[PDB]
From a paper:
The condensin protein complex plays a key role in the structural organization of genomes. Each head domain (hd) can be subdivided into a “RecA”-like lobe that contains the ATP-binding pocket and a “helical” lobe that merges into the coiled coils; they connect the heads to a half-doughnut-shaped “hinge” dimerization domain.
Although included in the crystallization construct, crystals of the Ct Smc2hd domain showed no electron density for the N-terminal Brn1 region, which presumably dissociated during crystallization (see below). These motions displace strictly conserved glutamine residues in the Smc2 and Smc4 Q loops, which are thought to coordinate the catalytic Mg2+ ion and contribute to nucleotide binding. In contrast, even the wild-type (WT) version of Ct Smc2hd-Brn1N was unable to bind ATP. The Smc2 head fails to bind ATP on its own, presumably because of the deformation of the Smc2 P loop observed in two different crystal forms, but readily binds and hydrolyses ATP when in complex with the Smc4 head.
Numbering used by the authors: 1 to 51, 61 to 220, 983 to 1177
Amino acid sequence: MRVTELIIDGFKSYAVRTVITGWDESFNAVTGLNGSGKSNILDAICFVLGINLQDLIYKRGQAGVTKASVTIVFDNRDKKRSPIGFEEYATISVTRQIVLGGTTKYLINGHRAQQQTVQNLFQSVQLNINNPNFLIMQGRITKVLNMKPAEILAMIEEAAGTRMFEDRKEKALKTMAKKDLKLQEITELLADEIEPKLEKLRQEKRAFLDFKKINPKVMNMIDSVEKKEMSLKHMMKTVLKDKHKIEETIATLDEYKRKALQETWEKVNGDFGQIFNELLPGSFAKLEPPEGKDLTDGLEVKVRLGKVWKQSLTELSGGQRSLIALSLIMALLQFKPAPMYILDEVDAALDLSHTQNIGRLIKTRFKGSQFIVVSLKDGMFQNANRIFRVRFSEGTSVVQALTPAD
């Protein structure tokens, strides 16, 4: 499902009921540097999705407005991507409301719904509200640029799905820990408790036969502890074989983990360089282990600016660093896909041509997903199919909808 309509009423700078309609299925751009209305559109979308709420009302809500409502209207004609249990609806609308005191209620298609129902709806179409895989904000770019090689790898390990192997390896390690401990309990009991009692007992019997009393049950005590020895010694050789079996299992786990990480590394590395080449024509990039280490020890971003390999991301300009981090983020979207993606103010250091390159990539390489790009600066992302310009007029934010190529 994709967005077709956004209705904001009494929410933040939208004092009056405001309907923003005609959202494109592929590439939308929300602009408006001055004022708060442009960013308020994103806050309204995040509010319905579920990312002191009385402050979100028009005046918190000390002035006239005392109720706030936001409604997202989804097109649901593509039944293949329809949320399960809602296939009959050609259109699904989710509404969230605020009243004084900051309590909220949800509506689905005009009928009251539980919050869990709305959350289960969004997560059924891979809009992970709890861990947003669809929200690319400026902080994510800054975070990626400062990631150490171990953290870059962790990003790749997640896409490879190697937690599968790591959970198994953690189980076997707890198992082999109990096995290892068992031999220590055996060796303590055997060497320090069973073997001394047995040789002392054989010594008493060896004092008695020599030319007086011996314990009548000495024959039995000998045979009793002699059996306990043969049982412990065989357990030694058995628990060790279990320990060997776990080691061979873990090595097979690590091998399949390494091979799965290798396939994901090559897939990401290929897309990452091509995406960066599209966003910054004439340049290239790759993920490579740091000088001297291995894949298991982490991955590192190497950038070729023009014909020059750069030693550090530190050496890149502001715009080049944003494009490098955005290229890596976009190269990983395929592993946790979403029907909708939101790009929030990543264009501070960018030129117009860079935003045009991002826009072309959205319409082609990422065709099949709906992109909403909230621009920071005006006049960016001009090749968007639908552009919503926010201004402020008569105490409320007003949105002008445009369709380039008229």
